[PDB]
């Protein structure tokens, strides 16, 4: 077969017009929040329509009267829920004539328009049609005979008290009978303009994605995974808009940064030296004057892989960073004695010989979580301990749980999407009720006299919900958490009981005052006139209180006598019988259940925080709020690999350190007396017999100064340069026994296998189609 990788490049000939019809006439789903694209979309449709009639993407005559009708109704359709018409009128036209508009290719508007329909007649104002649409949507009467609103206030808006006038097309749409959705409300009041009659909500506006390091992602194009970073601010995102710049910043506190930057923020790779203060997200107490961090930066944070070096203290850390703190695997060395001997006039070789062994013995490998070292709170043994705890249960519970695990999967495999949504809603409701179950049936009662009264508890509380945790939060178990100036490093030093009770009483009277203010401010408005639901209870979330109160009042003797006077002028049993039917239908008597319960409890349970793995990826019902304060600790090979890659990252990042003419280079490169020095970084001048450093033919003409350490350094630099070179230049005909040869062999094998698979698919298609 022909070699795909050895085609003769004698004649190169491409045929592609720059305004490419493949790339130009196309609408992307990536362009969703952009309004102008909508117009383009319609235009594109028109093009296709013309191609369907003339085949030239250009219309004879021009845009006709029926093109707008087609593009309005027939072109694109939107999802509705359900119609339910009727065939008989329920109103009378005996009132002032021309009150209701009449209602009896005539198929539709487009069919009539293409059959010679002028559509030129104009009549009536828009407000009448919008009011009629709202009235039919409500299925009520919103205006009386005189024309004054019946469901909204008709008096002029009081400028005092903060109220302002509101049009009907807004009030009758922001306040609706809950069987009308936002889309139908917008469609009823003729909201058509794309640019001015639409706004983006605070919680629904488009924002760039967050990908972090961007390692684990679904690749839309498998060959190039960088294509999936186009919607983020990742340093390697394609075409940011402004080129990444080699920033060399000196801050007023003498903190210096040198490396890649996006906009004006450090971004990509670089080296940062700390002066007074801090930077790169580090804590104020971590750094000193002269410490440095080399490695990856992201959004001004030391995020990724790097190395932190402190010349004053000697600590050296190599490894992973998240945000501005150590998070992941890391390796720690303490080279303090080496620096101590170096600063006291000892040559480096002698100091290394003296202090190599002690430093090598004290090398530490660790796993860090949010800047804290793990391994002291038995983080390593958590999983095994939890497995043993799960194994310590009674056999019946374990068997039932294991059967339920398979039953859930088998049930979910065959459910409909609507059934899945309902199931997830039920699960969410159950999870919520596991913390705050409503006091249904215990909100209102009747006293001895028969008067309805609220049902309080052993305290001054009507429901378990408190509005003070909204500003302070709640832990996983139920405790609140830190507050303003909470002090009490450990709460084993509690507050005095007298102060506690006094403050509790003061909080109770404050709650009473708050309730009084809320009532006197919001209780006058009416939300639901059928049940007397005011705005205060509606906005406090106590609608079920009113729902129970209505039934309690109507069932009371006083309520019954009032109803008589004005007239003068699931259940527990259902669940029980369903459970009994389920028990009977399976052939399991209650005696068997009692026997099994006795066997489990008296014979097994008497013989001798939810179950599961605390560190689990898939958890069915999660809530995305429970937080793990630990991670699987790195093993030695993983730490070694992390250090090996971090050293590569540091070496690659240390290439932005001495920009030729930059502020840091001009102001921080000094001799012994502190005066500036003329660094040999001229692009054309190589003085004092250093022309061997020229990376060209000129360098070969001159000789090296004959220093073994310099020769080793040059050899290492040459090795790095060759390693960089090999990644962009290949051989046309590789020799057998080399890596590139096996790569080419595998590529050819892949092509052959794909061709065979396609041939088999074609054979199957031919068999099916004939």
């Amino acid at each position: 077969l022909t070699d795909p990788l050895k085609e003769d490049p004698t004649v190169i000939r491409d045929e592609a017009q720059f305004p490419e019809p493949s790339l130009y006439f196309k609408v992307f789903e990536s362009e969703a929040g952009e309004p102008e694209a909508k117009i383009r979309a319609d235009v594109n449709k028109l093009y296709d329509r013309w191609i369907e009639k003339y085949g030239r993407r250009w219309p004879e005559d021009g845009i006709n009267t029926e093109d707008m009708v087609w593009l309005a109704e027939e072109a694109n359709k939107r999802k509705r829920a359900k119609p339910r018409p009727r065939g008989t009128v329920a109103a009378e036209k005996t009132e002032y004539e021309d009150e209701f508009m009449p209602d009896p290719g005539p198929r539709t508007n487009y069919e009539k328009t293409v059959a010679g329909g002028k559509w030129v007649t104009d009549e009536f104002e828009s407000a009448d049609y919008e009011a009629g649409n709202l009235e039919k949507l409500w299925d009520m009467y919103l205006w009386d005979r005189e024309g004054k609103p019946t469901m909204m206030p008709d008096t002029p808006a009081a400028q005092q008290e903060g109220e302002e006038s509101e049009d009907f097309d807004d009030f009758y749409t922001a306040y609706r009978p809950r069987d009308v959705d936002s889309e139908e409300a917008r469609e009823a009041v003729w909201a058509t303009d794309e640019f001015e009659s639409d706004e983006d909500n605070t919680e629904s506006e488009w924002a760039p994605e967050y990908v972090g390091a961007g390692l684990g992602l679904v690749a839309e194009d498998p060959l190039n995974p960088q294509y999936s970073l186009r919607h983020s601010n990742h340093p390697l995102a394609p075409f940011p808009g402004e080129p990444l710049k080699w920033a060399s910043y000196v801050y007023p506190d003498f903190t210096t940064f040198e490396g890649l930057s996006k906009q004006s923020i450090p971004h990509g790779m670089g080296v940062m030296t700390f002066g007074t203060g801090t930077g790169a997200g580090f804590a104020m107490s971590q750094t000193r004057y002269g410490d440095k961090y080399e490695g990856e930066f992201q959004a001004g944070y030391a995020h990724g892989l790097g190395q932190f070096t402190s010349e004053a203290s000697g600590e050296v850390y190599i490894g992973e960073f998240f945000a501005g703190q150590r998070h992941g695997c890391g390796m720690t060395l303490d080279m303090k004695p080496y620096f101590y001997l170096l600063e006291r006039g000892v040559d480096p070789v002698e100091a290394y010989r003296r202090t190599a062994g002690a430093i090598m013995k004290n090398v530490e490998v660790r796993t860090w979580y949010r800047g804290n070292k793990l391994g002291d709170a038995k983080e390593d043994e958590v999983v095994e301990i939890n497995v043993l705890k799960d194994e310590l249960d009674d056999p019946f519970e374990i068997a039932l749980r294991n059967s339920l695990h398979d039953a859930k999967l088998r049930k979910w495999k065959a459910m409909s999407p609507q059934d899945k949504a309902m199931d997830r809603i039920v699960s969410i409701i159950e999870r919520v009720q596991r913390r705050n179950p409503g006091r249904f049936g215990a909100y209102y009662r009747e006293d001895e006299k028969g008067r309805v009264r609220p049902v309080l508890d052993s305290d001054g509380a009507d429901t378990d919900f408190d509005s003070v945790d909204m500003i302070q939060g709640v832990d996983t178990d139920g405790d609140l958490g830190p507050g303003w100036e909470g002090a009490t490093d450990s709460e084993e030093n509690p507050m005095d009981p007298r102060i506690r009770e006094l403050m509790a009483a003061e909080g109770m009277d404050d709650k009473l005052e708050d309730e009084g203010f809320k009532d006197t401010v919001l209780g006058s408005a009416i939300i639901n006139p059928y049940t007397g639901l005011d705005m205060k209870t509606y906005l406090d979330g106590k609608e079920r209180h009113q729902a129970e109160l209505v039934s309690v009042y109507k069932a009371s003797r006083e309520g019954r006598k009032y109803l008589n006077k004005v007239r003068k002028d699931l259940s527990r049993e259902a669940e029980d019988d369903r459970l009994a039917r389920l028990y009977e239908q399976a052939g399991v008597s209650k005696e068997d259940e009692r026997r099994v319960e006795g066997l489990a409890a008296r014979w097994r349970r008497l013989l001798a925080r939810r179950p599961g793995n605390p560190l689990a990826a898939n958890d069915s019902d999660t809530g995305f709020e429970t937080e793990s304060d630990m991670m699987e600790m790195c093993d030695i090979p993983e730490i070694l690999g992390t250090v090996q890659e971090a050293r590569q990252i540091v070496e690659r990042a240390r290439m932005w350190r001495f920009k030729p003419y930059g502020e840091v280079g001009l102001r921080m490169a000094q001799d012994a007396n502190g005066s500036p020095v003329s660094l040999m970084q001229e692009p054309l001048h190589y003085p004092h017999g250093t022309k061997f450093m020229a990376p060209g033919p000129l360098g070969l003409c001159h000789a090296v100064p004959d220093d073994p350490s310099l020769r080793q350094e040059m050899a290492k630099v040459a090795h790095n340069y060759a390693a960089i070179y090999r990644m962009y230049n290949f051989d046309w005909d590789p020799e057998p026994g080399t890596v590139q040869y096996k790569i080419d062999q595998r590529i050819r094998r892949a092509q052959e296998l794909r061709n065979n698979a396609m041939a088999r698919y074609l054979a199957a298609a031919d068999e099916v189609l004939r």
Binding site: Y352, A356, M360, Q712
Partner: peptide
Amino acid sequence: TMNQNIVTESVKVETNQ
């Protein structure tokens, strides 16, 4: 219990460990 620095030697000794 051609040219390499202290970190490489320590990593190699741990790898042998």
